[PDB]
Amino acid sequence: SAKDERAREILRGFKLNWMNLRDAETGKILWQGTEDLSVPGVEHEARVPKKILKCKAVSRELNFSSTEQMEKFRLEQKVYFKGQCLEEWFFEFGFVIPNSTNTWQSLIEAAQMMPASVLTGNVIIETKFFDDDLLVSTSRVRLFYV
Numbered sequence: 001s002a003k004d005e006r007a008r009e010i011l012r013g014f015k016l017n018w019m020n021l022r023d024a025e026t027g028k029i030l031w032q033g034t035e036d037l038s039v040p041g042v043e044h045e046a047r048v049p050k051k052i053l054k055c056k057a058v059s060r061e062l063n064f065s066s067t068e069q070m071e072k073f074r075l076e077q078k079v080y081f082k083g084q085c086l087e088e089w090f091f092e093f094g095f096v097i098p099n100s101t102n103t104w105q106s107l108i109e110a111a112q113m114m115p116a117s118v119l120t121g122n123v124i125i126e127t128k129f130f131d132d133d134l135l136v137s138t139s140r141v142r143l144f145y146v
């Protein structure tokens with residue numbers, strides 16, 4: 001398909017350079033990393049402070065570069081606990097200039113959370129990156145709450 005070829009081209013030109021997460025109330029930085037957690041086909045791991053589970057909302061800064069132009073870059077993301085999706089989020093970035101580097105800010109709302117001790121190692125966040133309806137990649141991060 002021209003569409004599958006196009007998906008592979010966008011993925012080939014894409015890199016997530018760095019990402020931060022903040023308490024949306026505090027503005028305090030809770031986690032940061034420079035590892036591209038969006039790379040597909042390998043299970044990524046992340047160690048995050050357990051106090052993040054007590055935030056009402058978390059603010060994400062995601063810096064990415066893309067050789068390919070995209071009309072409607074967006075994400076759909078799910079939290080899975082032992083295999084079961086507990087919640088889903090949708091975020092839209094929109095147009096991406098070819099060969100651009102971009103910082104995307106998002107406010108992620110928590111929608112009752114189990115304790116960190118129960119969740120740790122048993123949560124996966126699965127993120128699907130799309131351009132409009134074309135699925136570009138699917139990646140997964142297993143979470144440890146410390």
Ligand SMILES: C=CC[C@H](COc1ccc(-c2nc3ccccc3n2Cc2ccccc2)cc1)n1c(-c2ccccc2)nc2ccccc21
Pocket residue numbers: 016019021031037038046048052053055056057058060062077079086108109110113119123125127141143
């Ligand atoms: C305000 C709710 C707290 C938090 C919210 O969720 C997210 C926080 C960051 C992301 C996220 N955006 C990404 C973009 C590209 C690639 C991966 C991305 N992720 C997953 C991620 C990002 C950074 C570190 C670890 C995992 C996705 C969801 N959350 C977290 C959580 C805490 C810290 C970091 C990530 C998730 N674990 C939860 C378990 C049950 C319910 C909600 C949970």
